[PDB]
């Protein structure tokens, strides 16, 4: 089991203050990189790769 938000498409929200963030890609089964515009979007949105890996891979 992993949190439900791991299965969401990565969402840059509606702002343009783009910063790198990490999300889980279920199609490829790994954590990957996107640009987040800084406001809104969803919880498939991590500051580090390591964090994405520990939350959206496997059942903790």
């Amino acid at each position, epitope marked *: 089991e992993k949190p439900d938000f791991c299965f969401l498409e990565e969402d840059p929200g509606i702002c343009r203050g*783009y910063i790198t963030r990490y999300f889980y890609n279920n199609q490829t089964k790994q954590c990957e990189r996107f*640009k987040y515009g800084g406001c809104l979007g969803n919880m498939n949105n991590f500051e580090t790769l390591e964090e994405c890996k520990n939350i959206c891979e496997d059942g903790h």
Partner: antibody
Amino acid sequence: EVQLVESGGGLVKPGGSLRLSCAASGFTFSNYAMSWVRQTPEKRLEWVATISRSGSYSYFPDSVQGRFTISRDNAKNSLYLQMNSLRAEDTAVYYCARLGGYDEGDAMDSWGQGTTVTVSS
Amino acid sequence: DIVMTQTPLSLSVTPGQPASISCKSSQSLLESDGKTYLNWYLQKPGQSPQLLIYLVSILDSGVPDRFSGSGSGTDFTLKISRVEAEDVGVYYCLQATHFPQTFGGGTKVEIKR
């Protein structure tokens, strides 16, 4: 054996509009974000739009942002770049590319041969 | 935006001799996952740019092993160990660590005959 085939370029008057199409073949289209890059006559290259896999989210740089919009159709393997408010400086060849994924360092690849947009009176 | 400065503008190389092309970024390209998003393209005569190298040093499928990439932070280097006829064209760099992703101005390569 990926192929991307842009069409839709022509002359457009300044402040006018034009839609460009990209027809994709040879891979599972909805698995990839997709991009447009342009090349000016001075042969400068400039990334100008990205659409997310589902087609729900898009990115654009400040130079085109609020003038251009993008959409895709995953049942048809196509995407469309709607350009509005065209200015002299949007004259370029526009190329479609595939955003190759995290394992490919987010590089764009498989650029089409491109369609040429000319903004003139 | 990040400015990518490529030198030389052009180069002319004896066949079988090496060639080198520099790309310098105005800020470090080191990303928060520890990788570096610096890529090399080739535009061959009559063709659109094609990916040669991504993540600084990784060859794309089908790129000859004559080509290699190195560097880090702000300073990058494309090398052709022994130049051949097929390598002629304009080479560009691209960085994608920072938004918006931005190209180098290109470097034309001519081969001697």
